[PDB]
Amino acid sequence: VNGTLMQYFEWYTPNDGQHWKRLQNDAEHLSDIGITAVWIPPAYKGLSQSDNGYGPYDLYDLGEFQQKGTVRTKYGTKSELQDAIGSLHSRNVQVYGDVVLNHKAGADATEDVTAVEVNPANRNQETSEEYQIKAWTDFRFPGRGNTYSDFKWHWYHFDGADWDESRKISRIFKFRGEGKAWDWEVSSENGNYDYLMYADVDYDHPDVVAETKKWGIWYANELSLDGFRIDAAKHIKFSFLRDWVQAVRQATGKEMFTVAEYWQNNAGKLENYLNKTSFNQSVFDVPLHFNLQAASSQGGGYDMRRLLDGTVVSRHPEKAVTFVENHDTQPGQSLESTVQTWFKPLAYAFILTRESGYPQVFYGDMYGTKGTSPKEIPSLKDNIEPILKARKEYAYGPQHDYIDHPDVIGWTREGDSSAAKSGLAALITDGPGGSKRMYAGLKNAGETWYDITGNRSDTVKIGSDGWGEFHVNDGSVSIYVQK
């Protein structure tokens, strides 16, 4: 059956500590609609209870220890997470854990460090004389102690930080020391994009490298994870991420599917990342997200024939996790690039009913986002579920593309022996609707198909030659399947 991923959280998921319970309770629903894997938010202790997990303090504290004024993380306790994972597994749904290895936040104390300021637009360029600062680099894990790992962090395990406690100033501080330099083989943006935020981990440090692989194996085992989602990959030494994934797979003997969040709308750079990680992990199809967002926001002027241009799914579908939206692109966020509501179901049809790519459904799109703007994403589960049904039960067999009009594009799937009634004919348009004749397969001759989305109430009779004339409304989507 087709695989479908679901990012199970949004930026405004509440800090009520009930998210793991929500996931456990949603297990049956997710399995029924076709979700086969869930990407959960960072499960370890952040700098505070309210942190979304991208400001990780202790990777070995899965909401288990008394650290940062809380036992549970924003999402819940370790046991509640394990219960959720157990429920998902009982329903044949896999779980991918978020991996945040770029930096550490919320150090226990500062340490005297000799550093130098670097140009934010070119981190290879020092901009000040070297001086002593008080950097938050001492991570001792007072609540966990040596449970699971006795590794303690110090300034020399980091390449830099952005805050000096002595002068109370923010700058991009690069640490001085034997062998200290920004990690190489990271995005070349800003000269060297190794530094992003908080205390930057030094992946040139052998102990850090070894300890992080040990943690990865521990993490996978502790939660019975089936895979990973790697955070801020373009800011982490590529060869390290390559080796880290390899180490976990070698130790667990499991596939451990991994998708990296390499955030750059550039197929060439994404290709480079794949090469530098020996194609051992997928990447989110950032270009496709931007193409979909462009189509949704250009008032019908976007040339739909170019929707696959420069996308990862077009070149390496085997390494592409296609998506419409995520917590960083949703309204008000750091990478804001929201696919407009009217086009959203069309975008989902594009990633869910086509043969290429591993598609991902966004929690915020299914259940809405709880931000405070006047443009929050509404709950679109009623529009998305019929499309998920199309993917689960009908998106099989030979595909025929008709991405041949600047507004109205479509494709068909003939269906195959995996499901006797599989097959579909999809049409989407970023402007006026209309009809398009498409070959749906001679094997479907004489059948009557209907629009599973319910947007149109008319049926289509497949001709004796396997062709049908399919219709779609203005700025809409229609997916015809056998009655």
Annotated binding site for Na(+): 159, 183, 194, 200
Query: Contacts with Ca ion in 152-181 (CB under 5 A)?
Result: 159
**CA distance to 201, 255, 279, per residue, from 220 (Å):** 21, 11, 21
Write out the DSSP string of 259-324: EE----S-HHHHHHHHHHTTT-SEEE-HHHHHHHHHHHHTTT-S-GGGTTTT-HHHH-GGGEEEES
- Give dist(CA 95, CA 229) in Å, integer: 10
Query: Contacts with Na ion in 64-123 (CB under 5 A)?
Result: none
Q: Which is nearer to Ca ion, 228 or 362 (CB)?
A: 228
- Give dist(CA 312, CA 323) in Å, integer: 11
Q: Residue 200 interacts with Na ion (CB under 5 A)? A: yes
Residues 6+ apart with CB under 8 A from 140: 108, 109, 152, 153
Q: Which stretch binds Na ion (CB under 5 A): 128-136, 193-201, 351-359, 442-450?
A: 193-201
User: What residue 430 binds from Na ion, Ca ion, none (CB within 5 to 8 A, per partner kind)?
Assistant: Ca ion
SS3 category, 389: helix
Single residue of 10, 183, 231, 243 touching Na ion by CB under 5 A: 183
State the binding site for Ca(2+): 102, 159, 181, 183, 194, 200, 202, 204, 235, 300, 407, 430
Q: Which is nearer to Na ion, 179 or 253 (CB)?
A: 179
Q: Residue 130 interacts with Ca ion (CB under 5 A)? A: no
CB of 274 within 8 A of CB of 246? no
The contact pattern for Ca ion, residues 353-372, with x = CB under 5 A and - = no contact, is --------------------
Q: Which two tokens stand for residue 338?
A: 């929201």
- The yes-or-no answer on residue 365 being catalytic is no
Q: Which stretch binds Na ion (CB under 5 A): 69-77, 88-96, 180-188, 419-427?
A: 180-188
Nearest to 44 by CA among 62, 64, 32, 30: 62
Q: Residue 200 interacts with Ca ion (CB under 5 A)? A: yes
- Give dist(CA 153, CA 133) in Å, integer: 17
Q: Which is nearer to Ca ion, 28 or 189 (CB)?
A: 189
Q: Which two tokens stand for residue 105?
A: 């936040």
Half-sphere exposure of 482 (CA within 13 A, CB side): 22
User: What residue 187 binds from Ca ion, Na ion, none (CB within 5 to 8 A, per partner kind)?
Assistant: none
CB atoms within 10 A of CB 475: 19
- Give dist(CA 29, CA 119) in Å, integer: 50
Active-site option among 10, 64, 117, 231: 231
Single residue of 26, 162, 194, 407 touching Na ion by CB under 5 A: 194
- The yes-or-no answer on residue 261 being catalytic is yes
Q: Which residues on neighbouring strands pair with residue 227, listed in sequence order? A: 96, 257
Q: ∠ at Cα 436 (430, 442), nearest 5°?
A: 135
Q: ∠ at Cα 199 (244, 40), nearest 5°?
A: 50
- Give dist(CA 189, CA 171) in Å, integer: 18
Single residue of 353, 430, 471, 481 touching Ca ion by CB under 5 A: 430
In the bound complex, what is the minimum distance in angstroms from residue 52's beta carbon to Na ion? 22
The contact pattern for Ca ion, residues 273-302, with x = CB under 5 A and - = no contact, is ---------------------------x-x
Q: Residue 102 interacts with Ca ion (CB under 5 A)? A: yes
User: What residue 226 binds from Na ion, Ca ion, none (CB within 5 to 8 A, per partner kind)?
Assistant: none
Q: Which two tokens stand for residue 3?
A: 């695989």
In the bound complex, what is the minimum distance in angstroms from residue 235's beta carbon to Ca ion? 4
Single residue of 98, 159, 261, 407 touching Na ion by CB under 5 A: 159
Q: Which stretch binds Ca ion (CB under 5 A): 4-12, 28-36, 97-105, 327-335?
A: 97-105
Phi, psi of 115 (to 5 degrees): -135, 175
- Give dist(CA 307, CA 290) in Å, integer: 9
Q: Which is nearer to Ca ion, 80 or 200 (CB)?
A: 200
User: What residue 285 binds from Na ion, Ca ion, none (CB within 5 to 8 A, per partner kind)?
Assistant: none
- Give dist(CA 415, CA 420) in Å, integer: 8
Query: For Ca ion, how many residues bind (rule: CB under 5 A)?
Result: 17
In the bound complex, what is the minimum distance in angstroms from residue 189's beta carbon to Ca ion? 12
Q: Residue 185 interacts with Na ion (CB under 5 A)? A: no
User: What residue 228 binds from Na ion, Ca ion, none (CB within 5 to 8 A, per partner kind)?
Assistant: none
Catalytic positions: 231, 261
Residues that bind Ca ion (CB under 5 A): 102, 159, 183, 194, 200, 202, 204, 235, 300, 302, 406-407, 423, 430-431, 444, 482
Residues that bind Na ion (CB under 5 A): 159, 183, 194, 200, 202
